[PDB]
Amino acid sequence: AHFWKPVLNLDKLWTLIPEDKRDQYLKSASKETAPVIDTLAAGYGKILGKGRIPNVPVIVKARFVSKLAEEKIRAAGGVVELIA
């Protein structure tokens, strides 16, 4: 119960966008309208950093994040929201 922390690398991280707004947010640097992503609603509890990702600023919502992960997201200009 306590030990549900199934990881998500920064690699995958757009398949959550089902297929279609993937393009619409890909061709956008929009700091005003950025896509929100729900790790928890997709069933992932902690972010880990493996990948390299575009610089498109995109929002992410999750509980647990590592340093390279948040650094890369802030490098794209996205942001983490530490929901419970």
Partner: protein
């Protein structure tokens, strides 16, 4: 050594019947490698990530060489942009058969490749990794 395959997939046997004939007649070392790959089992025909295709396509003079994979093909979300080339292989998954046309390239069969470049001309082969196996 092997002489003919274990499978019963009829089209696979048909491709073998073709590429045996070209390896008999035309003698280019491409066809023998094709055939010796086709005979093999599913472990030793591991799949080929389209990302790996792009890696090997970033080689020098490697922009229009029609890549060949006797095995299967797997889409990869880990990259976002991809070239437009002509790619031949046995089994294209639906995801990568979408991706490649999305890029604009064509996902071709093997017999059509035998029409287009029989002798192994302007081509390349990949054989996916096998010590990610257990």
């Amino acid at each position: 050594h092997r002489t003919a395959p274990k499978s019963d997939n009829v089209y696979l046997k048909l491709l073998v019947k073709l590429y045996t004939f070209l390896a008999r007649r035309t003698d280019a070392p491409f066809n023998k490698v094709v055939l010796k790959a086709l005979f093999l089992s599913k472990i030793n025909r591991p799949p080929v990530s389209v990302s790996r295709i792009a890696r090997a396509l970033k080689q020098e003079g490697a922009a229009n060489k029609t890549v060949v994979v006797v095995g299967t093909v797997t889409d990869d979300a880990r990259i976002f942009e991809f070239p437009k080339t002509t790619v031949a292989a046995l089994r294209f998954t639906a995801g990568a058969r979408a991706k490649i046309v999305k890029a604009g390239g064509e996902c071709i069969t093997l017999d059509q490749l035998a029409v287009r470049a029989p002798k192994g001309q302007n081509t390349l082969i990949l054989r996916g990794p096998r010590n990610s196996r257990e």
